[PDB]
Design a protein around this ligand. Sequence first.
Ligand SMILES: Nc1ncnc2c1ncn2[C@@H]1O[C@H](COP(=O)(O)OC(=O)[C@@H](N)CC(=O)O)[C@@H](O)[C@H]1O
Ligand SMILES: Nc1ncnc2c1ncn2[C@@H]1O[C@H](COP(=O)(O)OC(=O)[C@@H](N)CC(=O)O)[C@@H](O)[C@H]1O
Ligand SMILES: Nc1ncnc2c1ncn2[C@@H]1O[C@H](COP(=O)(O)O)[C@@H](O)[C@H]1O
Lengths: 580, 580
Amino acid sequence: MRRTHYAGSLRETHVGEEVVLEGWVNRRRDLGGLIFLDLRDREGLVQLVAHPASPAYATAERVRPEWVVRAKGLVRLRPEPNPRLATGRVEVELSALEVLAEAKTPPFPVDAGWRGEEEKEASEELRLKYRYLDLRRRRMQENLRLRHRVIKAIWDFLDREGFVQVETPFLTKSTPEGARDFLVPYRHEPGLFYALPQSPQLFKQMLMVAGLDRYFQIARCFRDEDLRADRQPDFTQLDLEMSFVEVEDVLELNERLMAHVFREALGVELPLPFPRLSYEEAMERYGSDKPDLRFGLELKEVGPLFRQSGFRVFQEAESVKALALPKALSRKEVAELEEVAKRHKAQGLAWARVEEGGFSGGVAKFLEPVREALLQATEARPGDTLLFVAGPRKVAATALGAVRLRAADLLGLKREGFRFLWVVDFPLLEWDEEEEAWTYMHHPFTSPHPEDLPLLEKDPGRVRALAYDLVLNGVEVGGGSIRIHDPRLQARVFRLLGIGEEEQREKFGFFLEALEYGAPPHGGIAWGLDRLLALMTGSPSIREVIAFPKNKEGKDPLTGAPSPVPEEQLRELGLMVVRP
Amino acid sequence: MRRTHYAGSLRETHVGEEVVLEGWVNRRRDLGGLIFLDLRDREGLVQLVAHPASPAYATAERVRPEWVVRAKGLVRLRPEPNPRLATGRVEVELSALEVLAEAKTPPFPVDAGWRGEEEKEASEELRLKYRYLDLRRRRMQENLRLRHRVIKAIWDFLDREGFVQVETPFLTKSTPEGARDFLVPYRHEPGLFYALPQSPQLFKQMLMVAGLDRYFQIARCFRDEDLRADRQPDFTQLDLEMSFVEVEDVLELNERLMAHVFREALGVELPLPFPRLSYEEAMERYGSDKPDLRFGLELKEVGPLFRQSGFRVFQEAESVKALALPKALSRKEVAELEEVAKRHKAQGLAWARVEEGGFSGGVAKFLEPVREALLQATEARPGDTLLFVAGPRKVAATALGAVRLRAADLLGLKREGFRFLWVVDFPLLEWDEEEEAWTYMHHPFTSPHPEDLPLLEKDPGRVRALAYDLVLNGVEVGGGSIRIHDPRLQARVFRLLGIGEEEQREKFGFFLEALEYGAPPHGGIAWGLDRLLALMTGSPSIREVIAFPKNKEGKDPLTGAPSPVPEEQLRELGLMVVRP
Ligand SMILES: Nc1ncnc2c1ncn2[C@@H]1O[C@H](COP(=O)(O)OC(=O)[C@@H](N)CC(=O)O)[C@@H](O)[C@H]1O
Ligand SMILES: Nc1ncnc2c1ncn2[C@@H]1O[C@H](COP(=O)(O)OC(=O)[C@@H](N)CC(=O)O)[C@@H](O)[C@H]1O
Ligand SMILES: Nc1ncnc2c1ncn2[C@@H]1O[C@H](COP(=O)(O)O)[C@@H](O)[C@H]1O
């Protein structure tokens, strides 16, 4: 039994050796009297050859794709090297072959990728229903193995930096991360529930109050919220906290860590330190707090330039933001971008061609009377086309910010590599419109900027937080902040967030008490690990870097969960379904 | 701000350096116009000294226990070194001291352990209620940091052996491990529930079906079952699976893994290979499938010595188990061990002292007629006491077995170090008496011995399983098996387990179907990581090696979980509370 090597590990150096391989029949080809079988295992393919003389022939004759076999043979040099395979120079002449398991015909192929050939995408629902076969594809294995490598690299780095890995509870008390809690009924007292954690937040802070100076965990978080390609109800974060630190210490720690991860997993060198943008200029220059820096097209305020201009939209509007495309837009594209701008609360979109001494279409007429001031502000050249969106403040920036992303796609602009950036100076709060009150921008335990303290009642929304987001290619891959460690301030900010003394006691009593026993200053961050890996593998969604993810409905096609349970069982938990 | 060293790191090599330390005031001593503060942080204590001529004095005068401070000073050599502290040869002469956070008086002290003194164990319900202060104690931090070291050692080793770490789902389908599932209500369709995993069993096997080749995971597990000192409702396993292996392969891999963990985490060299005992030998020699080998008192069959004895009990019993105690028992103790034997279905216990040349006490007169054969069989020596339990086979063994354990306590038998062993050749099944049918001894996917197959439908109960438990100091720290990879055999065993073709479909259909797509032979094991660590740290329960555990009722006195939730919340899940 015991194999001597991994099928896909055989190289020229192995010629002459008798080997025992174990794997799956990737493909069978009857070519002449000979039978060639491509044996695969996780390290790749290797060609097996059965001659009619050999006792292995009868078996090689009966074999089908995905059948599991034990193969014994002599490694020989291929008279015809196959450049597309790592084992390409060699092949195994078979002396024996045993079938260990047969396999029904798979609902989709898994063989192409192992030959370097392109794979037709199968329906996701189908891939999910037979995830165990989907995970046989090379791309899927590369993804999981990269996930492994990334986490080991994180452990190696934080361990060396002195971090203590601590596992926090899953059957706990509710954590406010902005989402709904998944509940777990407590059998001995119907009506009582545990909440799965939205994050380890309160526990990692308590670990700081406990004197473990620095902590980390590959934490699983649960949030019963609306799901999309960057959202699973059950996800992973690289959670981390440090004591006696200031914003700089955290960000500096994270960059060295991230660069260690990219060097180790991708062999890519990240230039340090990462660029930084205040929440204002990121919102100014890109209409978003997770800027995609794989391309320019920066937003520019040109509202002053149109304070007395022929058309009313750029005249009446608070701000008019404009950017410059390096290529022209078709009129179906222009129509699209226009649709984009209106999905973001803006009236519409405007544009004009930048000629070699003038302007051409759209609103070019109104640009001529300001040509040298407008072309100065935009830096627009001849052959570009300017895009404009007017209206309020936020809306002009967000709308022309979204159209900036769409345009980069349509104009298929070079978007390669990784571009990280810290978005800092976020505002402490955020206005909840569906409930006429303030809520947290990140979470309630986020510390206000040491100064904006007075303004904490004068003007709630002008308060700066010691928060920060880590973004990669326009995706928020991490978020954290320095925490409030003074118990007074925490209850103050708690009141501001609308919670009364009594709710504070039911929801965070234990934690406010913890702050009174000598909490040191602390802060941290949490990366969305699934997101970071999706990006590191150029995957279209995080589902591609999770072994067994859920579909958009939060369901598991593979197992059938969530599924019904016998009445006796629910009854035993003192629960019953109020169904229609 | 930034400190220059960890308070507890200062050594003689640091004399003469100016330093910045940050930490907690472990204790304050006003000793004669001199103030001594013991500063503590994760790495230990340092003695800070404040002289009245120092700008630090006023502040050192105002501080209290558990206050967080920043201290600056010059490291000096102590005139009189304190042998009990790693920083004992030094002290730091303060030049500055700042209070960063005051603390209120702690409900229990946390300072003793850091001085190497002994701590009075406070109420566990109290330690739990303020777990963040409890975790300030040195022993708790040594426990958590040892857990970290152990997990990192597992990752370094398995990574080097080629194992892929894969994170498996928590909102998933039920997995049978012998317990009740914890459920999570799916809100978009009342009556539909996810089950937290009792283990990753089925996913780890499907991952073998997917061709990864060896997998592992530090997996959080959930079992709603009666709790106790070695049971938490949510615990951690080192979960592992391998393909194309036989029992020997899995055991060798685990032995080297475990050796590595001990070498790295404790600096202890485990002698390999671990001894092995079949289930039957373990029951014969110790009356337990989880022997504590830290002492002898091995059980001996001695029934054939009393087939014609004056004493009815030894005469008409199927077996007579004896053991030798190296010291004498008091009358109360003999009474206790007697009570212990009775609580295990045995009619009673018998004893007798082994005299130089004879026997005295209890049943000594019936021993004299076989004195040399008996002393032969028990290797008893003068000064010993022989213990006896008679009755049907398993009862004799089990009862004397339990008496053995209790006797080692009472006799305070010298139990030191770590004694591992593999208990192999478990039976495939185990009879369920409150059901009147067979169940699984481990779990349903456990493979029957390759040939006891006929005895299957025919002789259920005589069937051996390729299953194995790993035991340490009489505690089951791990369990696994080679699995069934043939889908027909799995269904056969499913039927035998009292599960009809239709239940098989709802509960394991996705899995049975997976075994039909070419599953390779595979097997694995799971360690109870909390149990391993409780044992590695000499802890009285696994709660001592979990940062935030539940108490025996499964409640969290720190947090208050589980707790009630608003009617609105329960309504939206379509659920309602009722009487069981
Ligand atoms: N549903 C989801 N599916 C997948 N990934 C998700 C999902 N939700 C979030 N993420 C990722 O987790 C990162 C951190 O989450 P936050 O809630 O911002 O931080 C927290 O949980 C704070 N306790 C961190 C801290 O303050 O230190 C996000 O940036 C994102 O990439
Ligand atoms: N409630 C609990 N609290 C704390 N520790 C626990 C608890 N229950 C179990 N353990 C520990 O985990 C080990 C493996 O669990 P098993 O159920 O034997 O096997 C399994 O789960 C199989 N899938 C393993 C396999 O076959 O690979 C036990 O030996 C024990 O130390
Ligand atoms: N199965 C047994 N094994 C050992 N000692 C026993 C057993 N049953 C009874 N004894 C002992 O035999 C003696 C007489 O028991 P009793 O007849 O109950 O008075 C007492 O020493 C009991 O402890």
